[PDB]
Protein backbone atom coordinates (compact mmCIF):
# COMPACT_ATOMS: atom_id res chain seq x y z
CA UNK A 1 0.00 0.00 0.00
CA UNK A 2 0.96 3.66 -0.32
CA UNK A 3 0.99 3.94 3.47
CA UNK A 4 3.41 1.02 3.86
CA UNK A 5 5.62 2.29 1.04
CA UNK A 6 5.78 5.68 2.76
CA UNK A 7 6.51 3.95 6.08
CA UNK A 8 9.50 2.13 4.59
CA UNK A 9 10.76 5.25 2.80
CA UNK A 10 10.52 7.22 6.07
CA UNK A 11 12.07 4.57 8.32
CA UNK A 12 15.69 5.20 9.33
CA UNK A 13 16.05 1.79 11.03
CA UNK A 14 15.00 -0.62 8.25
CA UNK A 15 17.54 -1.77 5.66
CA UNK A 16 18.14 -4.54 3.14
CA UNK A 17 21.08 -6.30 4.78
CA UNK A 18 23.74 -8.37 3.02
CA UNK A 19 27.13 -9.42 4.40
CA UNK A 20 28.20 -10.31 0.85
CA UNK A 21 26.78 -9.46 -2.57
CA UNK A 22 25.50 -13.02 -3.05
CA UNK A 23 23.26 -12.71 0.02
CA UNK A 24 20.57 -10.81 -1.87
CA UNK A 25 17.86 -13.20 -3.06
CA UNK A 26 14.88 -12.45 -5.32
CA UNK A 27 11.85 -11.24 -3.35
CA UNK A 28 9.66 -14.14 -2.30
CA UNK A 29 6.41 -14.30 -4.29
CA UNK A 30 3.24 -16.15 -3.31
CA UNK A 31 1.28 -17.27 -6.36
CA UNK A 32 -2.52 -17.07 -5.93
CA UNK A 33 -4.85 -19.81 -7.11
CA UNK A 34 -6.41 -19.64 -10.57
CA UNK A 35 -10.02 -19.19 -11.64
CA UNK A 36 -11.83 -18.58 -14.95
CA UNK A 37 -11.10 -15.18 -16.52
CA UNK A 38 -13.74 -14.21 -19.09
CA UNK A 39 -12.35 -10.66 -18.89
CA UNK A 40 -8.94 -11.91 -20.04
CA UNK A 41 -10.66 -13.94 -22.76
CA UNK A 42 -12.34 -10.71 -23.91
CA UNK A 43 -8.98 -8.95 -24.01
CA UNK A 44 -7.56 -11.81 -26.10
CA UNK A 45 -10.56 -11.50 -28.43
CA UNK A 46 -9.56 -7.88 -29.01
CA UNK A 47 -5.87 -8.72 -29.41
CA UNK A 48 -6.44 -11.29 -32.18
CA UNK A 49 -8.66 -8.85 -34.11
CA UNK A 50 -6.59 -8.29 -37.28
CA UNK A 51 -4.80 -11.60 -37.87
CA UNK A 52 -6.37 -12.08 -41.32
CA UNK A 53 -4.73 -8.86 -42.55
CA UNK A 54 -1.26 -9.92 -41.35
CA UNK B 1 29.21 29.49 -27.20
CA UNK B 2 31.12 28.97 -23.96
CA UNK B 3 33.24 26.22 -25.54
CA UNK B 4 34.10 28.49 -28.47
CA UNK B 5 35.07 31.31 -26.10
CA UNK B 6 37.24 28.88 -24.13
CA UNK B 7 38.94 27.79 -27.35
CA UNK B 8 39.51 31.43 -28.32
CA UNK B 9 41.06 32.19 -24.92
CA UNK B 10 43.28 29.11 -25.11
CA UNK B 11 44.43 30.11 -28.60
CA UNK B 12 45.17 33.63 -27.37
CA UNK B 13 47.24 32.18 -24.51
CA UNK B 14 49.15 29.57 -26.54
CA UNK B 15 50.62 32.13 -28.95
CA UNK B 16 51.58 35.80 -28.88
CA UNK B 17 50.03 36.60 -32.26
CA UNK B 18 48.59 40.12 -32.37
CA UNK B 19 44.89 39.99 -33.22
CA UNK B 20 42.81 42.61 -35.04
CA UNK B 21 40.62 45.39 -33.70
CA UNK B 22 37.54 43.70 -35.15
CA UNK B 23 38.46 40.49 -33.32
CA UNK B 24 38.95 42.38 -30.06
CA UNK B 25 35.61 44.17 -30.37
CA UNK B 26 33.66 41.03 -31.28
CA UNK B 27 35.32 38.98 -28.53
CA UNK B 28 34.67 41.66 -25.90
CA UNK B 29 31.03 41.99 -26.97
CA UNK B 30 30.46 38.23 -26.87
CA UNK B 31 32.18 37.89 -23.48
CA UNK B 32 30.04 40.68 -22.01
CA UNK B 33 26.88 39.12 -23.47
CA UNK B 34 27.73 35.67 -22.07
CA UNK B 35 29.16 36.95 -18.77
CA UNK B 36 26.30 35.57 -16.68
CA UNK B 37 27.01 32.01 -17.91
CA UNK B 38 30.73 32.00 -17.10
CA UNK B 39 32.11 29.49 -14.62
CA UNK B 40 34.94 30.77 -12.40
CA UNK B 41 37.54 28.80 -14.36
CA UNK B 42 36.46 30.14 -17.76
CA UNK B 43 36.14 33.63 -16.29
CA UNK B 44 39.72 33.47 -15.00
CA UNK B 45 40.87 32.14 -18.38
CA UNK B 46 39.25 35.04 -20.24
CA UNK B 47 40.54 37.61 -17.74
CA UNK B 48 44.08 36.27 -18.18
CA UNK B 49 43.67 36.27 -21.96
CA UNK B 50 42.70 39.95 -21.90
CA UNK B 51 45.38 40.88 -19.34
CA UNK B 52 48.23 39.21 -21.25
CA UNK B 53 47.51 41.25 -24.38
CA UNK B 54 46.79 44.35 -22.25
CA UNK B 55 43.32 45.18 -23.60
CA UNK B 56 40.87 47.04 -21.36
CA UNK B 57 37.36 47.92 -22.54
CA UNK B 58 35.39 47.63 -19.31
CA UNK B 59 35.70 43.84 -19.53
CA UNK B 60 37.12 43.72 -16.00
CA UNK B 61 34.19 45.66 -14.51
CA UNK B 62 31.71 43.59 -16.53
CA UNK B 63 33.26 40.38 -15.20
CA UNK B 64 33.41 41.74 -11.64
CA UNK B 65 29.67 42.43 -11.81
CA UNK B 66 29.04 38.66 -12.00
CA UNK B 67 32.16 37.16 -10.40
CA UNK B 68 30.91 37.23 -6.75
CA UNK B 69 28.22 34.75 -7.79
CA UNK B 70 30.77 32.44 -9.45
CA UNK B 71 33.34 32.66 -6.63
CA UNK B 72 31.60 29.98 -4.55
CA UNK B 73 32.65 27.27 -7.05
CA UNK B 74 36.19 28.57 -7.64
CA UNK B 75 39.21 26.29 -7.44
CA UNK B 76 42.60 27.34 -6.11
CA UNK B 77 44.07 28.05 -9.55
CA UNK B 78 41.04 30.11 -10.59
CA UNK B 79 41.17 32.00 -7.29
CA UNK B 80 44.86 32.80 -7.86
CA UNK B 81 44.25 34.00 -11.41
CA UNK B 82 41.23 36.13 -10.49
CA UNK B 83 42.98 37.73 -7.52
CA UNK B 84 46.11 38.50 -9.54
CA UNK B 85 44.20 39.99 -12.47
CA UNK B 86 41.50 41.97 -10.68
CA UNK B 87 43.73 43.36 -7.92
CA UNK B 88 45.79 45.11 -10.61
CA UNK B 89 43.08 45.85 -13.18
CA UNK B 90 40.28 47.26 -11.00
CA UNK B 91 40.40 50.87 -9.85
CA UNK B 92 41.54 51.33 -6.26
CA UNK B 93 38.68 51.05 -3.74
CA UNK B 94 36.15 50.20 -6.47
CA UNK B 95 34.54 46.89 -5.42
CA UNK B 96 35.73 45.93 -1.91
CA UNK B 97 32.85 43.45 -1.75
CA UNK B 98 34.44 41.39 -4.52
CA UNK B 99 37.78 41.14 -2.71
CA UNK B 100 35.93 40.26 0.49
CA UNK B 101 34.14 37.46 -1.37
CA UNK B 102 37.45 36.13 -2.71
Amino acid sequence: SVASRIHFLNSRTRFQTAVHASDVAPPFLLLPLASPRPLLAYHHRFRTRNRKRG
Amino acid sequence: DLRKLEETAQELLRGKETKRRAFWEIFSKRVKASAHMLSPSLMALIAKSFDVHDRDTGIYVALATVLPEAVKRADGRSLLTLSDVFSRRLKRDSNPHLFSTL
Binding site: - | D1, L2, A33, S34, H36, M37
Partner: protein
Protein backbone atom coordinates in the same frame (compact mmCIF):
# COMPACT_ATOMS: atom_id res chain seq x y z
CA UNK C 1 -11.93 34.47 -30.59
CA UNK C 2 -10.10 34.04 -33.88
CA UNK C 3 -8.91 35.55 -37.14
CA UNK C 4 -11.54 35.52 -39.88
CA UNK C 5 -9.27 34.00 -42.55
CA UNK C 6 -8.03 30.57 -41.49
CA UNK C 7 -7.99 28.81 -44.87
CA UNK C 8 -4.48 28.11 -46.11
CA UNK C 9 -3.11 30.80 -48.42
CA UNK C 10 -2.03 28.75 -51.45
CA UNK C 11 -0.25 31.04 -53.91
CA UNK C 12 -1.40 30.32 -57.46
CA UNK C 13 1.67 31.94 -59.07
CA UNK C 14 5.26 30.75 -58.84
CA UNK C 15 7.57 32.87 -56.67
CA UNK C 16 10.51 34.91 -57.90
CA UNK C 17 14.10 34.44 -56.74
CA UNK C 18 13.78 37.03 -53.97
CA UNK C 19 10.39 35.69 -52.88
CA UNK C 20 11.61 32.10 -52.61
CA UNK C 21 14.79 33.19 -50.82
CA UNK C 22 12.74 35.09 -48.24
CA UNK C 23 10.45 32.07 -47.90
CA UNK C 24 13.33 29.64 -47.30
CA UNK C 25 15.82 31.78 -45.35
CA UNK C 26 14.30 30.89 -41.97
CA UNK C 27 16.19 27.58 -42.16
CA UNK C 28 19.41 29.60 -41.82
CA UNK C 29 18.26 32.51 -39.69
CA UNK C 30 16.55 30.37 -37.03
CA UNK C 31 19.68 28.40 -36.15
CA UNK C 32 21.89 31.47 -36.55
CA UNK C 33 19.77 33.50 -34.12
CA UNK C 34 19.43 30.58 -31.69
CA UNK C 35 23.23 30.43 -31.59
CA UNK C 36 23.51 34.21 -31.25
CA UNK C 37 20.96 34.30 -28.41
CA UNK C 38 22.51 34.54 -24.93
CA UNK C 39 19.24 34.43 -22.97
CA UNK C 40 16.16 32.23 -22.68
CA UNK C 41 14.01 35.27 -23.46
CA UNK C 42 15.84 35.77 -26.76
CA UNK C 43 15.68 32.06 -27.60
CA UNK C 44 11.93 31.92 -26.99
CA UNK C 45 11.33 35.18 -28.87
CA UNK C 46 13.19 33.83 -31.90
CA UNK C 47 11.26 30.56 -31.79
CA UNK C 48 7.94 32.40 -31.50
CA UNK C 49 8.92 34.66 -34.41
CA UNK C 50 9.59 31.58 -36.56
CA UNK C 51 6.59 29.68 -35.12
CA UNK C 52 4.71 29.67 -38.44
CA UNK C 53 7.68 28.56 -40.58
CA UNK C 54 7.39 24.92 -41.66
CA UNK C 55 8.65 22.32 -41.47
CA UNK C 56 10.60 22.16 -38.21
CA UNK C 57 13.05 19.29 -37.74
CA UNK C 58 14.45 17.23 -34.86
CA UNK C 59 17.79 19.03 -35.09
CA UNK C 60 15.95 22.36 -34.84
CA UNK C 61 14.24 21.16 -31.67
CA UNK C 62 17.50 19.77 -30.26
CA UNK C 63 19.38 23.00 -30.98
CA UNK C 64 16.66 24.97 -29.21
CA UNK C 65 16.79 22.68 -26.17
CA UNK C 66 20.59 22.70 -26.01
CA UNK C 67 20.69 26.49 -26.23
CA UNK C 68 18.07 26.75 -23.48
CA UNK C 69 20.09 24.49 -21.19
CA UNK C 70 23.29 26.42 -21.88
CA UNK C 71 21.72 29.86 -21.34
CA UNK C 72 20.41 28.52 -18.04
CA UNK C 73 16.89 27.22 -18.41
CA UNK C 74 13.48 28.85 -18.54
CA UNK C 75 10.00 28.46 -17.14
CA UNK C 76 8.71 25.19 -18.65
CA UNK C 77 5.17 26.66 -18.61
CA UNK C 78 5.82 29.81 -20.68
CA UNK C 79 3.63 29.48 -23.77
CA UNK C 80 6.67 30.12 -25.99
CA UNK C 81 8.36 27.05 -24.48
CA UNK C 82 5.06 25.16 -24.65
CA UNK C 83 5.25 25.58 -28.42
CA UNK C 84 8.60 23.75 -28.38
CA UNK C 85 7.36 21.06 -25.97
CA UNK C 86 4.21 20.36 -28.00
CA UNK C 87 6.28 20.17 -31.18
CA UNK C 88 8.65 17.71 -29.51
CA UNK C 89 5.75 15.53 -28.43
CA UNK C 90 4.32 15.72 -31.95
CA UNK C 91 7.57 14.51 -33.56
CA UNK C 92 8.65 12.16 -30.74
CA UNK C 93 8.51 8.98 -32.84
CA UNK C 94 10.66 10.57 -35.57
CA UNK C 95 13.54 11.37 -33.20
CA UNK C 96 16.52 9.07 -33.64
CA UNK C 97 18.12 10.12 -30.34
CA UNK C 98 15.02 10.47 -28.19
CA UNK C 99 17.11 9.92 -25.01
CA UNK C 100 19.04 13.12 -25.78
CA UNK C 101 15.75 15.04 -25.91
Amino acid sequence: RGIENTLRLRYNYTPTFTAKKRSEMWKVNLVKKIAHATDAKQVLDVWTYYRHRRTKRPYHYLLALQRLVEVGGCDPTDFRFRLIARGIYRTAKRFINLPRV
